Amino acid sequence: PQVTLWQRPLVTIKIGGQLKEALLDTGADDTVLEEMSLPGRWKPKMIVGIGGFIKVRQYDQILIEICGHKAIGTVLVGPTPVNIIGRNLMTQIGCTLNF
Amino acid sequence: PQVTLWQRPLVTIKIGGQLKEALLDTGADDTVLEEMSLPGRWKPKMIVGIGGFIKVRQYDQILIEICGHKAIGTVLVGPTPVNIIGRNLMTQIGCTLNF
Numbered sequence: 001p002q003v004t005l006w007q008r009p010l011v012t013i014k015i016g017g018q019l020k021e022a023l024l025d026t027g028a029d030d031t032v033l034e035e036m037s038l039p040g041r042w043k044p045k046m047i048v049g050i051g052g053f054i055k056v057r058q059y060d061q062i063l064i065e066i067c068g069h070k071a072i073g074t075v076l077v078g079p080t081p082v083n084i085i086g087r088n089l090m091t092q093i094g095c096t097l098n099f
Numbered sequence: 100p101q102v103t104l105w106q107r108p109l110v111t112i113k114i115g116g117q118l119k120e121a122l123l124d125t126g127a128d129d130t131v132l133e134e135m136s137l138p139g140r141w142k143p144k145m146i147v148g149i150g151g152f153i154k155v156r157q158y159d160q161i162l163i164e165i166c167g168h169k170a171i172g173t174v175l176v177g178p179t180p181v182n183i184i185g186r187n188l189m190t191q192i193g194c195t196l197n198f
């Protein structure tokens with residue numbers, strides 16, 4: 001459906017057997033979730049945003065359901081004040097901007 | 100038109116008599132442009148993103164053309180590595196996410 005932007009575009013994702021709210025971020029290249037326990041092997045990684053860098057744990061081949069749509073991809077876990085769904089998973093579910 | 104997200108959603112804006120590329124960011128509450136000269140009176144402001152805070156100059160009632168669509172609103176100028184069009188101006192031009 002058409003999600004307008006008067007308020008933040010938040011949605012519910014299910015990942016790691018848990019339900020969470022997340023922000024559909026067309027400006028985030030990656031998907032970054034708050035600290036949590038995930039099944040798998042991870043690598044350290046450094047990412048950067050407006051204020052500088054944060055170190056996150058990279059997870060690959062993670063199944064994540066975004067509003068009921070299964071998607072598999074790389075998830076970054078770390079100190080983000082808010083769970084962010086980046087363009088990587090959004091393209092998989094078919095999201096897009098309308099102008 | 101429907102802007103997909105395989106690559107970054109960049110567009111051309113015209114502001115301050117100049118043409119610039121900017122990112123359509125559904126995850127940014129505000130609009131933040133790289134340091135530039137703007138016509139007006141400004142207030143200092145602190146904003147925060149993934150890595151922490153940055154101090155920006157707030158400008159109000161600024162006319163900014165996004166891909167030819169005039170919009171008037173508050174612009175934040177400061178040390179951002181990339182010009183960001185936030186949800187504030189996007190709602191004015193009628194942008195929205197399609198799921």
Ligand SMILES: CC(C)(C)NC(=O)[C@@H]1C[C@@H]2CCCC[C@@H]2CN1C[C@@H](O)[C@H](Cc1ccccc1)NC(=O)[C@H](CC(N)=O)NC(=O)c1ccc2ccccc2n1
Nearest residue numbers: 025027028029030048049050081126127128129147148149
């Ligand atoms: C997540 C990551 C992969 C690191 N990518 C990014 O962070 C990219 C980096 C890009 C290049 C540098 C300039 C910014 C763009 C867009 N950002 C995405 C971009 O969408 C980013 C996502 C975000 C949201 C909340 C908190 C942190 C980060 N938004 C922001 O940084 C905007 C800044 C603004 N416009 O006011 N912040 C917020 O709108 C915002 C909202 C709620 C908050 C709650 C607590 C703390 C901070 C909060 N910040």
